[PDB]
Design a protein around this nucleic acid. Structure first.
Ligand SMILES: [Mg+2]
Ligand SMILES: [Mg+2]
Ligand SMILES: [Mg+2]
Ligand SMILES: [Mg+2]
Ligand SMILES: [Mg+2]
Ligand SMILES: [Mg+2]
Ligand SMILES: [Mg+2]
Ligand SMILES: [Mg+2]
Ligand SMILES: [Mg+2]
Ligand SMILES: [Mg+2]
Ligand SMILES: [Mg+2]
Ligand SMILES: [Mg+2]
Ligand SMILES: [Mg+2]
Ligand SMILES: [Mg+2]
Ligand SMILES: [Mg+2]
Ligand SMILES: [Mg+2]
Ligand SMILES: [Mg+2]
Ligand SMILES: [Mg+2]
Ligand SMILES: [Mg+2]
Ligand SMILES: [Mg+2]
Ligand SMILES: [Mg+2]
Ligand SMILES: [Mg+2]
Ligand SMILES: [Mg+2]
Ligand SMILES: [Mg+2]
Ligand SMILES: [Mg+2]
Ligand SMILES: [Mg+2]
Ligand SMILES: [Mg+2]
Ligand SMILES: [Mg+2]
Ligand SMILES: [Mg+2]
Ligand SMILES: [Mg+2]
Ligand SMILES: [Mg+2]
Ligand SMILES: [Mg+2]
Ligand SMILES: [Mg+2]
Lengths: 159, 33, 294, 139, 169
RNA sequence: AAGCUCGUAUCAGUUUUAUGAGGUAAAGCGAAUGAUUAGAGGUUCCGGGGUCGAAAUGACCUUGACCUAUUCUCAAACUUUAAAUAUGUAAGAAGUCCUUGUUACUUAAUUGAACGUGGACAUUUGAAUGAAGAGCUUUUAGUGGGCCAUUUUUGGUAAGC
RNA sequence: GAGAACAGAAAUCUCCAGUAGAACAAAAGGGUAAAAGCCCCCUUGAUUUUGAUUUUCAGUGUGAAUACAAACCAUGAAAGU
RNA sequence: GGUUGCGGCCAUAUCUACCAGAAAGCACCGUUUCCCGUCCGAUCAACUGUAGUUAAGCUGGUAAGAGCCUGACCGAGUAGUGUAGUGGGUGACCAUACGCGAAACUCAGGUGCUGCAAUCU
């Protein structure tokens, strides 16, 4: 018969990286987690307590709770035709902070600190990010650059 | 008192080791006369 | 030895943490010391690090940061001359001495020191320096053995009793204080006290000059040539405590020569390493040396 | 190849091994299409397009024998398989010019069937006590 | 050069491999006791061999570890029996060396029939001052190459003092 | 189907930016593992068949086993490496900053943790594109044999299987 | 791999190497080296109360597991577990 | 800059051989009354820092050294792949169009960085 046990199909997912096995360093235990933080689930196969379900591996969510040795992550699962809300109780080993978010706040500082010398110079702010635009004209120089024209090559066999 | 040497090794099987095998011996051997 | 390491071996070999190689860190008990309860957040766990070199005793109150462990305040036995101990600077008494120094010296610089006296009495007896209702709470610190064996009557738990007596809540039990008779399931406050004042260096001291004249002249070449009597010992240690609870505050040393100086001599016994051309050159010669089959 | 030119006139080596196992249902009322995993029915060797199947090395003059002797095998293989004259010296790498450079340079050391090469890499100590003629004044 | 890198016996170890449990083992135990004046350690069977007579965890043999100046005298009492002659075997490539004697009464020791006669293995292990580096718990390191016992060394040692012969090839 | 609350909301089978998770394709095997052809060199002082003074705890030996450096060929249930396509999250008013209230939690500690009073911040208020309006409640039909094509793919010699 | 009376291929002893090539009831896979393995010491957290949560999911039951709360205990010098 | 205690990352740090190391430090090293542990004060415990040595540990330097790390229009725009066609071919398969793009190979560079505290010609 078929197997659908709790850790099935996870042979490579919950495996430890090449020459990065063994004991878990201490920077992990030194991270502080607040409610409202955005984390990244990524199981550690050696720390088998507090372990996420193989699904949530690779997901990202918000901390709704902080406890002795674990954080409570909210994740929105899709089941059927509609997202549902899952409450995770995971241990600190299986969690990172999301860089993408832990930057955002720095743009928030900087974006609202352009605002500093913005009003304190009276001028225009102009904050919203604008995506890469088509190039502007150029004048490439022929000096020390006489276009070195090429042509297709013949066929050839090296066996 | 009865003092017992503790064997570090992790083997439990009452079994002669890979390092057994009756092949390898001798035609020689001490044969008293 | 012709068990040279295969190249496969060297390549799939996973190294231990640096200090696991040096054999200086027990990362197992490190983790369990450092880790704070998560909903206590940035609250540091404070560690009573107690190390023993061959000639010194090292005491540090330390916490942890990702960028690295951070030390609140450090005392050593090698300070103890300053407070009038100049012999036997690694014995039990030195430990209690040092543990008491770092006790005061910290919650001094925490300003907790006026409140939380510790003992002053010191008739050697199991007790925890606990708190004063309606007031603050004692500074809490957790003993970090290191790699020292946990033997009943171990130098390391001298520093403990030195420090608890100094008024840091440093949670401990008796059964590793000298004077713990396991049959009795009890502790002799008497013996534990003795050590605190060095009663075992005293009793041994007398037995020698009344057993072996010469062997005592050497073990104690110092005390003699300094005229410390065998039994002035206690009063030294006893008077040290005073002196220590008196001015715990760290005085440094006076050091000739600045950093720049010290530096520009010390490892100018440095071997500076070859440069690329020089090394290739060194080798190009090396060939013509061996080149010519013999 | 032998008869025509001689047991010592060539080296034939089959450059592909039968590693893939083949199955048969074996239809021994009957059994049908139910439970049709097959027993091992023999092996074969999976081959891409462009992949050397046989290789032979012989004396520069015995060419026309081997070829019309590979051709006689060609007729036993299903599919189009070409016959090719390799511009490399023997079962090695390196085009015949490039091989003779590394020969009269001494960077070549007759091994077991194949041949070891001098590297500019290892322990200069036993690079030299391995490949004397590179380093000796020789000629 | 050569100062603190002297050369000492690390330890001696007498090992009587009795080959059976029961009174004989506790009797050979008595022997090893009266020779070191320490109290010996019994060995249990690694596994079972019908053609030897043992079964796993039957208590077969008995040995004892002697260090210091006593082991020095007992090693002498031993070489006493082998008339100060060993072979270029007997010498581990890793510095140590060993030899054996049958009849333990051959080195001092009165008879006592209630005891019997046992033979034994004499294995002495050699090293240098500084060996603790490889034995201490904290900061456990390993000996320098230009240090540590080779076989040439601790055989030209064994000719020096004791003044003996190493034979064969 | 009936509507209800509202009215541009903050939505989206889409892109961008930032930052995650993955072990398939390919690749690799003079890298672990498991397979695999070929010689070469060295070991045995410890499997061994002789010859040589039956002599051999002495030699030259071809044969293994094993070591070392090479060579040809493989893997759905191998692997260091490792795509493409897919896949998680973030891109602010439910935000940011300043002051300082609350508490039995928490701290050596008015220390933190939450939750707030008062003050400052409204052009692009924090990417693109779209928005044919958004949100929400009730209730009930039919259906619950499917088939086909591109590609990925399992059993089978194969099949309009 | 090198060495030690009876001792042999295989008993007991010593050293050197040794990234795990061992071991951890079992299928296989993951995990683990001052351990998760081996030796020892102390023990009943295999206990008490009901709630929250992950998997299968209808987001019903069941089996299983995860993190807390409130008890009463074990252990360690302790943090802890 | 050297050294020690506690570290962060955890080979640019590991491995093998050879050298060198001022000062302080660390060390090996002396001892067994005492607490404590061993078949064995070897380990573990305590006492001296007194009797001795940098021999080792440790720190560096050497190496066309093994490994490990970084880069390159080195291989390779190869292998593989998302999209298109009433594209080619009997077919296996292949090319083109809008895009992504490896591994091995080869070559060049490198061989610990660093937070706290104490201390030192
Ligand atoms: Mg299945
Ligand atoms: Mg490891
Ligand atoms: Mg469990
Ligand atoms: Mg065992
Ligand atoms: Mg062993
Ligand atoms: Mg511990
Ligand atoms: Mg007593
Ligand atoms: Mg100074
Ligand atoms: Mg069937
Ligand atoms: Mg079947
Ligand atoms: Mg209706
Ligand atoms: Mg898979
Ligand atoms: Mg493949
Ligand atoms: Mg590859
Ligand atoms: Mg292979
Ligand atoms: Mg290689
Ligand atoms: Mg595969
Ligand atoms: Mg937008
Ligand atoms: Mg319906
Ligand atoms: Mg229905
Ligand atoms: Mg269609
Ligand atoms: Mg499709
Ligand atoms: Mg042997
Ligand atoms: Mg039960
Ligand atoms: Mg410095
Ligand atoms: Mg004693
Ligand atoms: Mg000693
Ligand atoms: Mg000690
Ligand atoms: Mg050291
Ligand atoms: Mg190299
Ligand atoms: Mg394609
Ligand atoms: Mg179409
Ligand atoms: Mg193609």
């Amino acid at each position: 018969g078929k197997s659908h046990g709790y850790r099935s199909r996870t042979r490579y997912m919950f495996q430890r990286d090449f020459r990065k096995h063994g004991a878990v360093h201490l920077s992990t235990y030194l991270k502080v987690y607040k409610v409202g933080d955005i984390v990244d689930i990524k199981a550690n196969g050696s720390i088998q307590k507090g372990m996420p379900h193989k699904f949530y591996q690779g997901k990202t969510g918000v901390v709704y709770n902080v406890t002795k040795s674990s954080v409570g992550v909210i994740i929105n699962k899709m089941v059927g035709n509609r997202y549902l809300e899952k409450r995770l109780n995971l241990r600190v080993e299986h969690i990172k902070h999301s860089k993408c978010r832990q930057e955002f706040l720095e743009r928030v500082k900087a974006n609202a600190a352009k605002r500093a010398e913005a009003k304190a110079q009276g001028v225009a702010v102009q904050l919203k990010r604008q995506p890469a635009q088509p190039r502007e004209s150029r004048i490439v120089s022929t000096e020390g650059n006489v276009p070195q024209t090429l042509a297709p090559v013949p066929y050839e066999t090296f066996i | 008192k009865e003092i017992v040497k503790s064997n570090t090794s992790s083997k439990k099987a009452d079994v002669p080791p890979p390092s057994a095998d009756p092949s390898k011996a001798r035609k020689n051997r001490p044969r008293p006369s | 030895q012709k068990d040279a390491k295969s190249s496969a071996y060297s390549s799939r070999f996973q190294t231990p943490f640096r200090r696991r190689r040096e054999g200086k860190t027990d990362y197992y008990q490190r983790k369990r010391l450092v880790t704070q309860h998560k909903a206590k957040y940035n609250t540091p766990k404070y560690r009573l690090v107690v190390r023993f070199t061959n000639k010194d005793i090292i005491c540090q109150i330390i916490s942890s940061t990702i960028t690295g462990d951070v030390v609140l305040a450090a005392a050593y036995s090698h300070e103890l001359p300053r407070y009038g101990i100049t012999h036997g600077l690694t014995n039990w008494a030195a430990a209690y001495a040092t543990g008491l120094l770092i006790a005061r010296r910290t919650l001094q610089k925490l300003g907790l020191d006026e409140t939380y006296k510790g003992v002053e009495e010191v008739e050697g007896e199991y007790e925890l320096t606990e708190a004063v209702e309606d007031g603050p709470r004692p500074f809490k610190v957790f003993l970090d053995i290191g790699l020292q064996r946990t033997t009943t009557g171990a130098r390391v738990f001298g520093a403990l009793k030195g420090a608890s007596d100094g008024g840091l809540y440093v949670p401990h039990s008796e059964n590793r204080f000298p004077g713990w008779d396991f049959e009795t399931e009890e502790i002799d406050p008497e013996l534990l006290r003795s050590y605190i004042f060095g009663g075992h260096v005293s009793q041994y001291m007398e037995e020698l000059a009344d057993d072996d004249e010469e062997r005592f002249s050497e073990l104690f070449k110092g005390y003699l040539a300094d005229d410390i009597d065998a039994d002035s010992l206690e009063d030294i240690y006893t008077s040290a405590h005073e002196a220590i609870r008196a001015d715990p505050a760290f005085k440094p040393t006076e050091k000739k020569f600045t950093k720049e100086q010290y530096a520009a001599e010390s490892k100018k016994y440095r071997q500076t390493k070859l440069s690329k051309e020089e090394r290739a050159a060194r080798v190009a010669a090396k060939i013509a040396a061996l080149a010519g089959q013999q | 190849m032998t008869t025509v030119s001689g047991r010592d006139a060539f080296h034939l080596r089959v450059r592909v091994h039968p590693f893939h196992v083949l199955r048969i249902n074996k239809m021994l009322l009957q059994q049908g299409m139910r439970g049709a995993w097959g027993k091992p029915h023999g092996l074969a060797a999976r081959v891409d397009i462009g992949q050397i199947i046989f290789s032979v090395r012989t004396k520069d003059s015995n060419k026309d024998v081997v070829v019309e002797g590979l051709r006689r095998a060609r007729y036993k293989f299903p599919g189009q398989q070409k016959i090719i004259l390799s511009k490399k010296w023997g079962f090695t790498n390196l085009d015949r010019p490039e091989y003779l450079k590394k020969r009269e340079a001494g960077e070549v050391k007759d091994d077991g069937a194949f041949v070891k090469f001098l590297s500019k890499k290892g322990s200069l100590e036993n690079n030299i006590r391995e490949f004397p003629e590179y380093f000796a004044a020789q000629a | 050069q050569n100062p603190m890198r002297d050369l000492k016996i690390e330890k001696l170890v007498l090992n009587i491999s009795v080959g059976e449990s029961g009174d004989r083992l506790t009797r050979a135990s008595k022997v090893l006791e009266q020779l070191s004046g320490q109290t010996p350690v019994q060995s249990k069977a690694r596994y079972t061999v019908r053609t030897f007579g043992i079964r796993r965890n039957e208590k077969i043999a008995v040995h004892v570890t002697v260090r210091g100046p006593k082991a020095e005298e007992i090693l002498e009492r031993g070489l006493k029996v082998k008339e100060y002659q060993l072979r270029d075997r007997n010498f581990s490539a890793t510095g140590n060396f060993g030899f054996g004697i049958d009849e333990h009464i051959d080195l001092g020791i009165k008879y006592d029939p209630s005891i019997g006669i046992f033979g034994m293995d004499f294995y002495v292990v050699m090293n240098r001052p500084g060996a603790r580096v490889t034995r201490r718990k904290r900061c456990k390191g390993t000996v320098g190459n230009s240090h540590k016992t080779t076989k040439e060394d601790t055989v030209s040692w064994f000719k020096q003092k004791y003044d003996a012969d190493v034979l064969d090839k």
